[PDB]
Structures are given as structure tokens and as C-alpha cells.
Amino acid sequence: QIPASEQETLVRPKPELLKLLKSVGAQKDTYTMKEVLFYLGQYIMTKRLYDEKQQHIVYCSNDLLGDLFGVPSFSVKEHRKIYTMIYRNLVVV
Numbered sequence: 001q002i003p004a005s006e007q008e009t010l011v012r013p014k015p016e017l018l019k020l021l022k023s024v025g026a027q028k029d030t031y032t033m034k035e036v037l038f039y040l041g042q043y044i045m046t047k048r049l050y051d052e053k054q055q056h057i058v059y060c061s062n063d064l065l066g067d068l069f070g071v072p073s074f075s076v077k078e079h080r081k082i083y084t085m086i087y088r089n090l091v092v093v
């Protein structure tokens with residue numbers, strides 16, 4: 001869904017997203033988009049933000065992730081929409 005060159009973009013997360021990433025064990029200040037997505041996956045999983053009944057839906061309202069993304073929920077199947085929400089929260093190197 002996302003071009004390989006775009007997945008490999010080096011990015012510098014803003015303070016709030018960086019805190020989220022470091023909370024799930026991220027050890028760096030710069031990442032590829034691919035790596036950012038991994039740790040966001042890690043976060044959603046550990047906090048069980050996915051719906052138990054509809055496991056492709058993430059309810060991020062009232063959580064740090066919802067504050068970052070600006071939505072109450074989203075589907076994990078919509079990759080372009082996810083990238084769009086993330087870009088607000090980082091600076092390209």
C-alpha cells in the first residue's frame with residue numbers, strides 16, 4: 001500500500017510521539033517510517049487499543065495516540081490514512 005522508498009524515509013519524531021515510541025522500548029531519536037510503524041504497532045498491542053470484536057479497528061480516543069492522530073478510531077487496513085495521521089507528528093531528515 002505504501003511505496004518502498006516512502007517506508008524507508010528517515011524521520012525525527014516530535015517530542016510527544018518520541019515519548020510514545022520510547023515507552024515501548026525505542027532507543028533512538030531518528031527512525032525510518034517503517035520503524036515508527038513497528039513501534040506504533042507495539043503500542044496498540046500492549047495497550048490493547050484494538051477492538052476485541054472488530055480487531056482491525058483501533059479505538060485511540062482519550063489516549064495519547066488519539067491526541068497525536070486527531071481521530072477517535074481508525075482501521076489498520078487503511079495504510080495511506082495512517083501515514084497521513086503520522087506525518088503531523090514528525091520532521092523529515
Ligand SMILES: O=C(NCCN1CCOCC1)c1[nH]c2cc(Cl)ccc2c1-c1c(-c2ccccc2)ncn1Cc1ccc(Cl)cc1
Nearest residue numbers: 037038040041042044045050055076077078079080082083
Ligand atoms: O507493525 C505492525 N504490524 C506488524 C505485526 N503484524 C501483526 C498482525 O499481522 C500483521 C503483522 C503494525 N503497526 C501498526 C501501526 C498502526 Cl498506527 C496501525 C497498525 C499497525 C500494524 C498492523 C496491525 C495491528 C493490528 C492491531 C493491533 C496492532 C497492530 N495489523 C497489521 N498491521 C500492519 C500495518 C498496518 C498499517 C500500516 Cl500503515 C502499516 C503496517
